[PDB]
RNA sequence: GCUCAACGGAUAAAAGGUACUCCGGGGAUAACAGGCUGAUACCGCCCAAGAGUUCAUAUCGACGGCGGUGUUUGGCACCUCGAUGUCGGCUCAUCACAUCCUGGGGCUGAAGUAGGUCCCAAGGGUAUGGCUGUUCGCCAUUUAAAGUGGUACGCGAGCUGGGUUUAGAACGUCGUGAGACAGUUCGGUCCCUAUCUGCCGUGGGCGCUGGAGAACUGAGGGGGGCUGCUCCUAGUACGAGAGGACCGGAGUGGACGCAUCACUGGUGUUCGGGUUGUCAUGCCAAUGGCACUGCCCGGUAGCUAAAUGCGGAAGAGAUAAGUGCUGAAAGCAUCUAAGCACGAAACUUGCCCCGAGAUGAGUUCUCCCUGACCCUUUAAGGGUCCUGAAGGAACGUUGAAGACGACGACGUUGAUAGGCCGGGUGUGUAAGCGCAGCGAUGCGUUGAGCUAACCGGUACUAAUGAACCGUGAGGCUUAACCU
RNA sequence: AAUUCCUUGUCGGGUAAGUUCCGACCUGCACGAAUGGCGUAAUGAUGGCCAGGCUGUCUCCACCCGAGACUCAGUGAAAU
RNA sequence: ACACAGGUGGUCAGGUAGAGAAUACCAAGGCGCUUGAGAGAACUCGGGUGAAGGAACUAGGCAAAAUGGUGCCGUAACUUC
RNA sequence: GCUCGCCGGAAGACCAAGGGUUCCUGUCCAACGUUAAUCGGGGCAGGGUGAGUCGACCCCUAAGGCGAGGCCGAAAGGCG
RNA sequence: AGGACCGAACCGACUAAUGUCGAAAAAUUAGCGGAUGACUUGUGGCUGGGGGUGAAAGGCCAAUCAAACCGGGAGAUAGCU
């Protein structure tokens, strides 16, 4: 899922920033990543947390 | 959208409008002829004539209604003793409307409304 | 909202094309008085169709 | 004339007291619900010892409306208050047995014969 | 020799903040939008072992390859910093199909019913709420379906200003401090009468080659185009049981559109009545004024909906995907190459409305106009006087017509409007008087009195006779018909 | 938490559904004792959230009374 | 800047109802606000009413609506009593 | 002049402040009045303001100002 | 008795609409806060520009305030328009 978010200002500006939202149906987990400022890399870092979060679910069931 | 409606507003609220024709009706029967705007005169007929219709049948209750409306004893003095008597045969249409011209002030259609009789 | 450009005198004149006043052509003399009065209107002296109804 | 967010009184001994219309069934984006209509409602008020408690979502059929219904002769039947009979969301069968009020002739659709037979009037 | 941190060294003595800001400049240089590109994103194809019961072609399809779209994030600064001045919501939309449904089909490992994948198709429809400032998303409940995008991430000279972006303030963190921030949290002016284009309506002028009053043909254009459930056919076909068709017909709803007040209601400050405080008519009584109509209760005509009827087609022609027939090129096969037939809410029609300014200005029907002179660039000429018709317009009484025009009815050869009479309808037992009662008050007279826009009649009033505009037989050329 | 980035954190309650609200755990990015700490009756044109009453805010708009708007007569601007 | 819906100190300030100088109607007295007349469209502003439901609107019950007086009855948690 | 409507602890009647003849009368209508105007706080001309008791002035002081001499300060000038 | 309560005058200015070349260079309309006090107001004084005053906003100091107005340096300077 790809959605936008607003930004800051100082006079009248309008800065919209994109955010990535990965959703895993088998687990219902939702991981977002606004760390970077590049759609691709944000998705990757999101997938970094996505895989890591899924990895933690393994350790609990373990 | 005013479909099949009746009664002209005449740029005045109900209270003012009613009090207007009440005052005008009294002044009408006093001089038997007055100069006013055409639109105003055309609506004055729907007030004075019903009163003249009530003057033809004298009684005690009608005199009270004749006072209920117009709110003046001088008018009821003229009515039931002058108009009602001399208008017994007249089957409606006691008022005549004559278009004089235009007011020199605001250029409004002036009209002379008088009683049909006005023997003098 | 305002004009982007100044309207020429041509457009000004064309707009006033339908602003010209009309005539009367409804004159009529009284039967008794003969004064030229308006149709359906009483004369200056208070006449109408041969009757000085105003006596003024 | 029963739309969404409408409080209705119960006309059965199911233990409920007051319900609220959360969604009028029928067509897509349907505004009202007549007497002979089904509506999904929730129980906002019930009695202690009942077969149903506050917070249950189930279907119910209207029986009395203040708007009332019309007849083929043009006559209407204005009621006083809104009433409905609870049903079983899956089977649509009535829950209670007793009916605390009169109904209309329109419920004679065979799908609710129990309601008519258990009705004191009409 | 010091010293040139930046090493042609501004003398060899010199750190930060500003969202309270201010001045001079820039699209030479950034944020939103647009533009070029298309790495990334999205979509569609190519080969392909294997997973898969046998078999990849039932899909998927690793490992790799080739292109399209300009819907994402970005790249480059081409446009605007003597202003392109907003995220989201509300309202209103409009277009493209890579289709969410409905419709037409291919295959099945679809038995049936019901699904999966792919092809054709844009006509029409494509939810209601809780949380959040929301786009998004989560959840609940539906629905036939709750599609994906473009349109300055549609729309702010249409609205809101919640978010974020002015000045105030607080908390955490950082800083010696001013203040700052991958931060969050209270309170915070949205300016403008529309000249032009456009669009929704409505008129004036002229033209249509004679003028005028009506009726139509009809190019062309627009509106309309959704769909569920129940029963029947038949609980048949198929099927092991459970289940349970296609096709065609009838009935009944949801949303939407049009029209209409007869029905149920709303309103009805022009109708009737109740009543509080107060003022006035000398007092009581009876009424009127004022206090949002003083507050209220009912209510006619209209307008109007929640109310009542109606519509969505059926059908026809030509096609899409597709099924075909015959059949050669290729002695066979094969839907095609000639030829021929079916085949979608899609195309043109059929349904409704506009419509001859369609200057290509149409057709039909009816009515009216056929007088002397001059000058004569000897012209489809102009001027004088005599004539001025058909019809229209003006003015007037007005309309369920209407912003102003326009349109419709009538103008005494009269029911156009008002008044009047009768009745209807609505409101609820008037006033005055008599009787009873201590009185308030009640009873009888009386379902009376009073009744705006309603209906049927009546010329009492006002719609005056006439004047005004408009004319005198309508060019040339050619051909066909009578002398 | 007026403080918690990850995060709408995980459980209780409240609603059919609750990123806010009210209790609790403590994993305190980056609470902390006069930069006062934790509570606190009363008070507040205070911030946030429910319940009842109540209504045209809304489903969904309709009618009516007035001042403009439109026409007529007089006068007569402005930004651009 | 104007014959401008603004601002400007002190005194007197009545009758009925009313606690009151609130407020409603009036007295003495003073004005009808210096452009009017028709029409009764959309739409804008100032108000009234509304079937059924009752916040489903929305950032938020903003605005509107509603409650409202005197006498008596009665009144919880909590509390610095 | 006859009715109607509005304010009435004010849109009323008097003083101080502050303007400065705007007050009254006759007369005129171009300019001024957001329209017309024989009307007016408009133009023109004439007229009106009378106090031992009202107020100011006057006598006496408050905050505070000025301030002979005096102290201080480049001068100006400051305090008193 | 009360920086006590309800609530006019008076002072103030939280909400909404109208207004935005307005009637008005911050007002009007309908509701609100205080209303015996840290209250409000009239008259006359004192403190003044990098100073005055401030229940502290960087708010006010004659509609002009992160630095008033007037005159003079001064035709300042301007690699920019």
UniProtKB/Swiss-Prot annotation, chain A:
Signal sequence residues: none
Family according to the record: Belongs to the prokaryotic/mitochondrial release factor family.
Taxonomy, superkingdom: Bacteria
SS bond partners: none
Record motif GGQ motif, residues: 9-11
Name of this chain's protein: Peptide chain release factor RF2
Additional record remark: This provides a mechanism for the protein to regulate its own production.
Record's function text: Peptide chain release factor 2 directs the termination of translation in response to the peptide chain termination codons UGA and UAA. Acts as a peptidyl-tRNA hydrolase. In the presence of truncated mRNA in the 70S ribosome, ArfA and RF2 interact such that the GGQ peptide hydrolysis motif of RF2 rises into the peptidyl-transferase center (PTC) and releases the ribosome. Recruited by ArfA to rescue stalled ribosomes in the absence of a normal stop codon. A TnaC-stalled ribosome binds RF2, but the active GGQ motif is prevented from engaging with the PTC by TnaC.
Effect the entry attributes to changing residue 5 to A: In strain: BL21 and MRE-600; increased termination efficiency
Sequence positions bearing N5-methylglutamine: 11
Subunit structure: Interacts with the ribosome. Recruited to stalled ribosomes by ArfA, in the presence of truncated mRNA, ArfA influences RF2 conformation so RF2 can hydrolyze the peptidyl-tRNA bond. Biotinylated tnaC mRNA can be detected in a stalled 70S ribosome-RF2-TnaC-tRNA(Pro) complex.
Posttranslational modification: Methylated by PrmC. Methylation increases the termination efficiency of RF2. Is absent when the factor is overproduced.
Cellular localisation: Cytoplasm
From Swiss-Prot, chain B:
Listed InterPro entries: Ribosomal_bL17, Ribosomal_bL17_CS, Ribosomal_bL17_sf
Record-linked SUPFAM superfamilies: Prokaryotic ribosomal protein L17
Keywords annotated in UniProt: Ribonucleoprotein, Ribosomal protein
GO biological process, one term: cytoplasmic translation
GO molecular function, one term: structural constituent of ribosome
A Gene Ontology cellular-component term: cytosol
Keyword Ribosomal protein found: yes
Role played: Requires L15 for assembly into the 50S subunit.
Subunit structure: Part of the 50S ribosomal subunit. Contacts protein L32.
Protein family per UniProt: Belongs to the bacterial ribosomal protein bL17 family.
Name of this protein: Large ribosomal subunit protein bL17
Organism: Escherichia coli (strain K12)
Gene name as annotated: rplQ
Swiss-Prot record, chain C:
GO cellular component: cytoplasm; cytosol; cytosolic large ribosomal subunit
Keyword match Cytoplasm: no
Example of a GO biological process term: response to radiation
Protein name (record): Large ribosomal subunit protein bL32
PANTHER family in the record: 50S RIBOSOMAL PROTEIN L32, LARGE RIBOSOMAL SUBUNIT PROTEIN BL32
Pfam families: Ribosomal_L32p (PF01783)
Cysteine disulfide links: none
Single GO term (MF): structural constituent of ribosome
NCBIfam families cross-referenced by the UniProt entry: rpmF_bact
Coiled coil segments of this chain: none
Curated annotation (Swiss-Prot), chain D:
Phenotypic consequence of residue 117 to A: No change in RsfS binding
Keyword Iron (UniProt): no
Keywords tagged on the record: Ribonucleoprotein, Ribosomal protein, RNA-binding, rRNA-binding
Effect after changing residue 97 to A: Reduced RsfS binding
Function: Binds to 23S rRNA. Forms part of two intersubunit bridges in the 70S ribosome.
Record note on quaternary structure: Part of the 50S ribosomal subunit. Forms a cluster with proteins L3 and L19. Forms two bridges to the 30S subunit in the 70S ribosome, contacting the 16S rRNA. In pre-50S ribosomal subunits interacts with RsfS, which may inhibit association with the 30S subunit.
Protein name in the entry: Large ribosomal subunit protein uL14
